[PDB]
Structure formats: structure tokens, C-alpha cells
Amino acid sequence: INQVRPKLPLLKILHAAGAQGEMFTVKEVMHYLGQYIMVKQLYDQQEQHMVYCGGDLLGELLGRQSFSVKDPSPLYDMLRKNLVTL
Ligand SMILES: COc1nc(N(C)C)ncc1-n1nc2c(c1C(C)C)[C@H](c1ccc(C#N)cc1)N(c1cc(Cl)c[nH]c1=O)C2=O
Ligand SMILES: [Cl-]
């Protein structure tokens, strides 16, 4: 409904950040993605809107070495491709 099912590569990352199950809201997905970024401290301390995720699961998932949380077409492309609806 507003429930989505992450595809495997995304789901792995979600469970890594603590998520249980295979069905989520977009908010839930965002929460756990963000939690993942925060607990793995993938961001640059000196430029905190910049996520450096090369050589990480998330890097592979996004197909990027780095990205700006301010400019998340990388993120939304991944979600378009990794969230299965209805
Ligand atoms: C490294 O980033 C940060 N660093 C800090 N420090 C003080 C160090 N504080 C906040 C953030 N931060 N900014 C934003 C977000 C965060 C946390 C939750 C990672 C979330 C977000 C962004 C990207 C993904 C992915 N993959 C998942 C959630 N987010 C969002 C971005 C969009 Cl486009 C939609 N919804 C959001 O919640 C932001 O803008
Ligand atoms: Cl939690």
C-alpha cells in the first residue's frame, strides 16, 4: 500500500542497520539507510553532507564512491530500482 519490499542488496543494508523483516514504508527504509550511514560513519566529518561509501555495501548498492545527501538522485535511483511495491 505504502509498504514496499526492498530487493536483496538493499535489504541486507537495512538489516545491517537493525531492520527486521522484508516489508517497510519509505520512511522506514530512509531511517535505516540513514542509520546505516551514521553508525558506519560513512560521511566526511569535515563535509557532513558528503557520504563516502566506496568499498561498502552501500557503495555497491548505489554504484557510487561518494554522494551528497543534499543532492540525492543517486539515492532515489537506487530506491526506484530496489523497492518493490504492491
Ligand atoms: C551523512 O548525512 C548526515 N550527517 C549528519 N551529521 C550531523 C554527520 N546529519 C544528518 C545527515 N543526514 N542528512 C540527511 C540524512 C541524514 C542522516 C539520517 C544519514 C537523510 C538520509 C540521507 C541519505 C540516506 C541514504 N542513502 C538516508 C537518509 N537525508 C534525507 C535525504 C532525502 Cl533526499 C530524503 N530524506 C532524507 O531523510 C538527509 O538529507
Ligand atoms: Cl532501530
Which technique was the structure solved with, according to the deposited record?
A: X-ray
Ligand positioned closest to the Cα atom of 18: 2
Report how far residue 38's alpha carbon sits from residue 68's, in angstroms, rounded to the nearest whole number: 14
Three-class SS state of 56: coil
* Index of the ligand 1 atom closest to the CA of residue 76: 33
Q: Which three cell numbers stand for residue 6?
A: 526492498
The total of structural domains in the chain comes to 1
Locus of grid cell 563516502: 52
Centroid of ligand 2 to alpha carbon of 27 (angstroms): 13
CATH number of the domain where residue 68 is located: 1.10.245.10
Final resolution, Å = 2.4
62 burial (CB, 10 Å; 0-12 / 13-18 / 19+) is buried
What is the phi-psi region of residue 52: left when phi exceeds 0, alpha when psi lies from -120 to 50, beta otherwise? beta
What domain range is 71 assigned to?
1-86
